[PDB]
Chain length 146, copies 2
Protein backbone atom coordinates (compact mmCIF):
# COMPACT_ATOMS: atom_id res chain seq x y z
CA UNK A 1 0.00 0.00 0.00
CA UNK A 2 2.12 2.84 -1.32
CA UNK A 3 1.18 6.52 -1.15
CA UNK A 4 2.84 9.56 -2.79
CA UNK A 5 5.49 9.80 -0.06
CA UNK A 6 6.73 6.29 -0.78
CA UNK A 7 7.48 6.96 -4.44
CA UNK A 8 10.68 8.19 -6.06
CA UNK A 9 11.89 8.69 -9.65
CA UNK A 10 13.61 5.46 -10.70
CA UNK A 11 11.49 3.13 -8.57
CA UNK A 12 10.91 -0.22 -10.25
CA UNK A 13 7.91 -2.50 -9.66
CA UNK A 14 7.19 -6.00 -10.88
CA UNK A 15 3.95 -7.87 -11.32
CA UNK A 16 3.12 -11.55 -11.01
CA UNK A 17 2.69 -13.57 -14.23
CA UNK A 18 -0.22 -14.33 -16.48
CA UNK A 19 -0.49 -16.98 -19.20
CA UNK A 20 -2.33 -16.02 -22.41
CA UNK A 21 -4.32 -18.86 -23.99
CA UNK A 22 -5.93 -19.17 -27.41
CA UNK A 23 -9.49 -19.45 -26.10
CA UNK A 24 -9.07 -16.34 -23.91
CA UNK A 25 -7.75 -14.43 -26.94
CA UNK A 26 -10.88 -15.44 -28.95
CA UNK A 27 -13.27 -14.83 -26.04
CA UNK A 28 -11.96 -11.25 -25.56
CA UNK A 29 -11.63 -10.59 -29.32
CA UNK A 30 -15.11 -11.95 -30.04
CA UNK A 31 -16.50 -9.39 -27.60
CA UNK A 32 -14.31 -6.30 -28.14
CA UNK A 33 -12.05 -6.77 -31.18
CA UNK A 34 -13.78 -9.18 -33.59
CA UNK A 35 -11.21 -9.29 -36.37
CA UNK A 36 -10.05 -12.47 -38.19
CA UNK A 37 -6.48 -12.26 -36.93
CA UNK A 38 -7.66 -12.43 -33.30
CA UNK A 39 -10.43 -15.00 -33.88
CA UNK A 40 -9.17 -17.64 -36.27
CA UNK A 41 -5.83 -19.42 -36.47
CA UNK A 42 -6.10 -19.94 -40.25
CA UNK A 43 -7.27 -16.42 -41.12
CA UNK A 44 -4.48 -15.08 -38.84
CA UNK A 45 -1.80 -16.99 -40.76
CA UNK A 46 -2.64 -14.93 -43.87
CA UNK A 47 -2.43 -11.62 -42.00
CA UNK A 48 0.45 -9.34 -40.97
CA UNK A 49 0.43 -11.17 -37.62
CA UNK A 50 0.97 -14.43 -39.50
CA UNK A 51 -0.70 -16.49 -36.77
CA UNK A 52 -3.09 -15.94 -33.87
CA UNK A 53 -2.27 -12.77 -31.95
CA UNK A 54 -4.15 -11.14 -29.10
CA UNK A 55 -5.85 -7.78 -29.55
CA UNK A 56 -3.61 -4.92 -28.37
CA UNK A 57 -6.66 -4.00 -26.23
CA UNK A 58 -6.69 -7.46 -24.66
CA UNK A 59 -2.96 -7.06 -23.81
CA UNK A 60 -3.73 -3.59 -22.36
CA UNK A 61 -6.59 -5.04 -20.19
CA UNK A 62 -4.38 -7.91 -18.89
CA UNK A 63 -1.71 -5.28 -18.17
CA UNK A 64 -4.14 -3.29 -16.01
CA UNK A 65 -5.17 -6.43 -14.09
CA UNK A 66 -1.51 -7.26 -13.35
CA UNK A 67 -0.86 -3.66 -12.37
CA UNK A 68 -3.85 -3.56 -10.06
CA UNK A 69 -3.28 -6.90 -8.39
CA UNK A 70 0.52 -6.93 -8.15
CA UNK A 71 2.47 -4.61 -10.45
CA UNK A 72 1.68 -1.13 -9.10
CA UNK A 73 0.88 -1.40 -5.35
CA UNK A 74 -0.87 1.93 -4.90
CA UNK A 75 -2.92 2.04 -1.70
CA UNK A 76 -5.62 4.27 -3.14
CA UNK A 77 -5.77 2.55 -6.51
CA UNK A 78 -4.64 3.39 -10.02
CA UNK A 79 -6.34 6.38 -11.61
CA UNK A 80 -5.20 7.15 -15.12
CA UNK A 81 -5.40 10.56 -16.75
CA UNK A 82 -3.82 9.36 -20.00
CA UNK A 83 -1.12 7.21 -21.54
CA UNK A 84 1.26 6.77 -24.48
CA UNK A 85 0.61 3.25 -25.76
CA UNK A 86 2.50 1.06 -28.18
CA UNK A 87 2.65 -2.66 -29.02
CA UNK A 88 6.15 -3.51 -30.39
CA UNK A 89 5.65 -7.27 -30.63
CA UNK A 90 2.44 -9.33 -30.99
CA UNK A 91 1.09 -11.19 -27.94
CA UNK A 92 0.87 -14.92 -28.74
CA UNK A 93 -1.10 -17.88 -27.31
CA UNK A 94 1.10 -19.64 -24.72
CA UNK A 95 2.88 -16.43 -23.74
CA UNK A 96 3.77 -15.73 -20.12
CA UNK A 97 3.32 -12.03 -19.44
CA UNK A 98 4.44 -9.94 -16.50
CA UNK A 99 4.78 -6.18 -16.16
CA UNK A 100 7.83 -4.11 -15.21
CA UNK A 101 6.95 -0.54 -14.15
CA UNK A 102 9.32 2.40 -13.67
CA UNK A 103 8.53 5.82 -12.14
CA UNK A 104 9.96 8.38 -14.62
CA UNK A 105 8.76 11.54 -12.92
CA UNK A 106 6.68 12.91 -10.01
CA UNK A 107 4.97 16.25 -10.59
CA UNK A 108 3.02 17.64 -7.64
CA UNK A 109 -0.08 19.72 -8.27
CA UNK A 110 0.63 23.41 -7.60
CA UNK A 111 -3.09 24.04 -7.07
CA UNK A 112 -3.74 20.88 -4.99
CA UNK A 113 -0.60 19.92 -3.00
CA UNK A 114 -2.03 16.74 -1.53
CA UNK A 115 -1.56 14.95 -4.88
CA UNK A 116 0.85 14.61 -7.82
CA UNK A 117 0.86 13.28 -11.37
CA UNK A 118 3.27 10.33 -11.43
CA UNK A 119 4.58 9.22 -14.81
CA UNK A 120 4.74 5.42 -14.81
CA UNK A 121 6.25 3.48 -17.67
CA UNK A 122 4.97 -0.09 -17.73
CA UNK A 123 6.57 -2.58 -20.10
CA UNK A 124 4.63 -5.82 -20.55
CA UNK A 125 7.04 -8.60 -21.46
CA UNK A 126 6.71 -12.21 -22.54
CA UNK A 127 9.07 -15.06 -21.52
CA UNK A 128 11.47 -14.13 -24.30
CA UNK A 129 12.08 -10.71 -22.79
CA UNK A 130 10.29 -8.97 -25.68
CA UNK A 131 7.98 -6.02 -25.09
CA UNK A 132 4.39 -6.74 -26.17
CA UNK A 133 3.23 -3.38 -24.78
CA UNK A 134 4.65 -0.17 -23.40
CA UNK A 135 2.33 2.18 -21.57
CA UNK A 136 3.84 5.49 -20.38
CA UNK A 137 0.95 6.55 -18.15
CA UNK A 138 0.25 9.57 -15.99
CA UNK A 139 -1.39 8.44 -12.74
CA UNK A 140 -2.92 10.60 -10.01
CA UNK A 141 -1.36 9.80 -6.65
CA UNK A 142 -2.33 11.38 -3.33
CA UNK A 143 -0.24 11.33 -0.16
CA UNK A 144 -1.53 9.28 2.81
CA UNK A 145 -4.48 10.98 4.52
CA UNK A 146 -4.10 12.34 8.05
CA UNK B 1 -14.59 -1.70 -47.15
CA UNK B 2 -12.14 1.17 -47.44
CA UNK B 3 -8.52 0.83 -48.57
CA UNK B 4 -5.68 3.40 -48.52
CA UNK B 5 -6.85 5.01 -51.78
CA UNK B 6 -10.24 5.84 -50.29
CA UNK B 7 -8.84 7.84 -47.40
CA UNK B 8 -8.09 11.56 -47.17
CA UNK B 9 -6.99 13.94 -44.41
CA UNK B 10 -10.15 15.37 -42.84
CA UNK B 11 -12.34 12.33 -43.44
CA UNK B 12 -14.86 11.79 -40.67
CA UNK B 13 -16.38 8.44 -39.65
CA UNK B 14 -19.13 7.61 -37.21
CA UNK B 15 -19.93 4.44 -35.34
CA UNK B 16 -23.22 2.98 -34.18
CA UNK B 17 -24.14 3.31 -30.49
CA UNK B 18 -23.51 1.22 -27.43
CA UNK B 19 -25.18 1.44 -24.02
CA UNK B 20 -22.98 0.94 -20.94
CA UNK B 21 -24.69 -0.85 -18.04
CA UNK B 22 -23.67 -1.27 -14.42
CA UNK B 23 -23.38 -5.06 -14.57
CA UNK B 24 -21.17 -4.88 -17.69
CA UNK B 25 -18.92 -2.35 -15.92
CA UNK B 26 -18.53 -4.77 -12.94
CA UNK B 27 -18.13 -7.84 -15.15
CA UNK B 28 -15.26 -6.21 -17.11
CA UNK B 29 -13.73 -4.55 -14.01
CA UNK B 30 -13.92 -7.78 -11.99
CA UNK B 31 -11.83 -9.46 -14.67
CA UNK B 32 -9.37 -6.75 -15.78
CA UNK B 33 -9.59 -3.72 -13.47
CA UNK B 34 -10.75 -4.93 -10.03
CA UNK B 35 -10.77 -1.63 -8.15
CA UNK B 36 -13.54 -0.46 -5.77
CA UNK B 37 -14.59 2.47 -7.92
CA UNK B 38 -15.40 0.15 -10.84
CA UNK B 39 -16.94 -2.65 -8.74
CA UNK B 40 -19.09 -1.11 -6.04
CA UNK B 41 -21.54 1.77 -6.15
CA UNK B 42 -20.96 2.68 -2.48
CA UNK B 43 -17.15 2.45 -2.54
CA UNK B 44 -17.22 4.51 -5.79
CA UNK B 45 -19.16 7.33 -4.12
CA UNK B 46 -16.22 7.90 -1.76
CA UNK B 47 -13.68 8.01 -4.61
CA UNK B 48 -12.57 10.72 -7.05
CA UNK B 49 -15.15 9.31 -9.48
CA UNK B 50 -17.83 9.91 -6.84
CA UNK B 51 -20.03 7.11 -8.19
CA UNK B 52 -19.68 4.03 -10.38
CA UNK B 53 -17.45 4.66 -13.37
CA UNK B 54 -16.21 2.24 -16.00
CA UNK B 55 -12.53 1.34 -16.26
CA UNK B 56 -10.75 3.50 -18.86
CA UNK B 57 -9.68 0.11 -20.29
CA UNK B 58 -13.31 -1.00 -20.57
CA UNK B 59 -14.12 2.25 -22.46
CA UNK B 60 -11.07 1.62 -24.71
CA UNK B 61 -12.27 -1.98 -25.44
CA UNK B 62 -15.84 -0.82 -26.26
CA UNK B 63 -14.26 1.85 -28.49
CA UNK B 64 -12.36 -0.80 -30.46
CA UNK B 65 -15.53 -2.90 -30.89
CA UNK B 66 -17.43 0.13 -32.25
CA UNK B 67 -14.51 1.00 -34.50
CA UNK B 68 -14.26 -2.54 -35.84
CA UNK B 69 -17.96 -3.09 -36.40
CA UNK B 70 -19.01 0.36 -37.61
CA UNK B 71 -16.74 3.30 -36.81
CA UNK B 72 -13.67 2.69 -38.97
CA UNK B 73 -14.71 0.66 -42.07
CA UNK B 74 -11.27 -0.58 -43.11
CA UNK B 75 -11.50 -3.52 -45.51
CA UNK B 76 -8.36 -5.21 -44.22
CA UNK B 77 -9.02 -4.51 -40.56
CA UNK B 78 -7.60 -2.17 -37.96
CA UNK B 79 -3.97 -2.74 -37.05
CA UNK B 80 -2.62 -0.41 -34.42
CA UNK B 81 1.03 0.50 -34.02
CA UNK B 82 0.38 2.85 -31.10
CA UNK B 83 -1.91 5.52 -29.70
CA UNK B 84 -2.14 8.64 -27.52
CA UNK B 85 -4.91 7.89 -25.03
CA UNK B 86 -6.80 10.09 -22.61
CA UNK B 87 -10.07 9.91 -20.67
CA UNK B 88 -11.39 13.47 -20.07
CA UNK B 89 -14.70 12.48 -18.48
CA UNK B 90 -15.71 9.29 -16.63
CA UNK B 91 -17.90 6.73 -18.42
CA UNK B 92 -21.09 6.18 -16.41
CA UNK B 93 -23.73 3.40 -16.21
CA UNK B 94 -26.61 4.31 -18.55
CA UNK B 95 -24.33 6.16 -20.97
CA UNK B 96 -24.87 5.91 -24.72
CA UNK B 97 -21.49 5.87 -26.44
CA UNK B 98 -20.61 6.27 -30.09
CA UNK B 99 -17.28 7.08 -31.72
CA UNK B 100 -16.39 9.94 -34.07
CA UNK B 101 -13.12 9.34 -35.98
CA UNK B 102 -11.11 11.87 -38.01
CA UNK B 103 -8.13 11.17 -40.31
CA UNK B 104 -5.47 13.74 -39.29
CA UNK B 105 -2.67 12.57 -41.55
CA UNK B 106 -1.64 9.90 -44.09
CA UNK B 107 2.06 9.04 -44.21
CA UNK B 108 3.08 6.47 -46.83
CA UNK B 109 5.96 4.13 -46.13
CA UNK B 110 9.03 5.17 -48.14
CA UNK B 111 10.43 1.63 -47.84
CA UNK B 112 7.11 -0.17 -48.52
CA UNK B 113 4.89 1.94 -50.84
CA UNK B 114 1.91 -0.39 -50.73
CA UNK B 115 1.01 0.87 -47.24
CA UNK B 116 0.85 4.02 -45.10
CA UNK B 117 0.55 4.99 -41.44
CA UNK B 118 -2.79 6.77 -41.05
CA UNK B 119 -3.27 8.93 -37.97
CA UNK B 120 -6.84 8.47 -36.76
CA UNK B 121 -8.27 10.51 -33.92
CA UNK B 122 -11.25 8.75 -32.36
CA UNK B 123 -13.35 10.63 -29.81
CA UNK B 124 -15.75 8.45 -27.82
CA UNK B 125 -18.72 10.54 -26.72
CA UNK B 126 -21.70 10.00 -24.46
CA UNK B 127 -25.23 11.41 -25.07
CA UNK B 128 -24.24 14.71 -23.49
CA UNK B 129 -21.61 15.33 -26.14
CA UNK B 130 -18.77 14.90 -23.63
CA UNK B 131 -15.59 13.03 -24.53
CA UNK B 132 -15.06 9.93 -22.37
CA UNK B 133 -12.01 8.93 -24.42
CA UNK B 134 -9.75 10.32 -27.10
CA UNK B 135 -7.45 7.93 -28.93
CA UNK B 136 -5.08 9.47 -31.50
CA UNK B 137 -3.94 6.22 -33.10
CA UNK B 138 -1.52 5.34 -35.87
CA UNK B 139 -3.02 2.57 -38.01
CA UNK B 140 -1.34 0.60 -40.80
CA UNK B 141 -3.37 0.81 -43.99
CA UNK B 142 -2.52 -0.94 -47.26
CA UNK B 143 -3.94 -0.04 -50.68
CA UNK B 144 -6.30 -2.55 -52.34
CA UNK B 145 -4.42 -5.58 -53.68
CA UNK B 146 -4.19 -6.18 -57.43
Amino acid sequence: GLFLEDLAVGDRFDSARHRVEAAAIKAFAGEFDPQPFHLDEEAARHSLFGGLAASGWHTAAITMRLLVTSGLPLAQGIIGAGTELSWPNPTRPGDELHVETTVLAITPSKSRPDRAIVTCQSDTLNQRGEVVQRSTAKVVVFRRPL
